[PDB]
């Protein structure tokens with residue numbers, strides 16, 4: 001099980017948000033902590049992505065771009081898994097020090113998005129998603145969004161995506177009905193990431209007004225990479 005040995009080995013550890021849980025809840029503090037957590041998660045996602053089997057087959061310019069486009073979806077997917085395993089989808093487990101209950105979902109003004117992420121969390125239980133399926137699905141999520149004008153070397157990306165889909169087939173084989181369920185679950189991440197992309201974009205544009213902090217590396221991606229997705233230049237690869 002060489003492929004699965006690697007995914008398990010490179011799987012990031014626990015990442016905290018650094019949120020002050022002794023403050024009474026506020027919109028500004030909650031989303032500043034989400035933004036800070038997004039910064040910290042991005043660092044771990046880059047190190048995770050670069051250690052993936054066959055990742056440096058990609059063109060150097062494509063490596064960071066692919067991570068930055070998939071970044072939000074990857075965070076959402078892993079968070080849903082965290083939520084399922086830690087609290088049985090009762091709350092959104094963004095981090096040990098940032099667990100969203102229904103009040104915090106409302107307070108963040110992302111209630112609709114949180115509800116859909118809670119549904120995603122529950123689907124891990126309903127579908128009985130194994131830890132190994134999760135790891136392969138999450139790796140496949142990285143290679144599930146590309147620019148319409150094409151990557152620097154689209155062929156290497158296409159080959160790499162195909163290989164990860166093959167590994168998912170092998171994990172399933174031990175098939176058709178299962179592959180259908182998992183690809184449908186993967187597809188459901190993209191609409192959620194879209195809504196979050198739109199929401200964090202708007203928040204960045206009015207950040208100065210609402211007193212929400214955006215780290216340097218966050219402001220860049222949400223101002224440079226995310227608008228390409230929102231403007232239709234970069235689109236996700238849907239199975240169905």
Ligand SMILES: CO[C@@H]1C(c2ccc(C#N)c(Cl)c2C)=NN2CC[C@H](O)[C@@H]12
Nearest residue numbers: 034035037038041075076079094196200
């Ligand atoms: C930078 O990403 C933020 C975010 C976010 C942050 C950390 C994590 C984690 N872990 C997750 Cl799942 C999400 C959806 N969700 N987005 C909505 C609000 C916020 O500005 C932005």
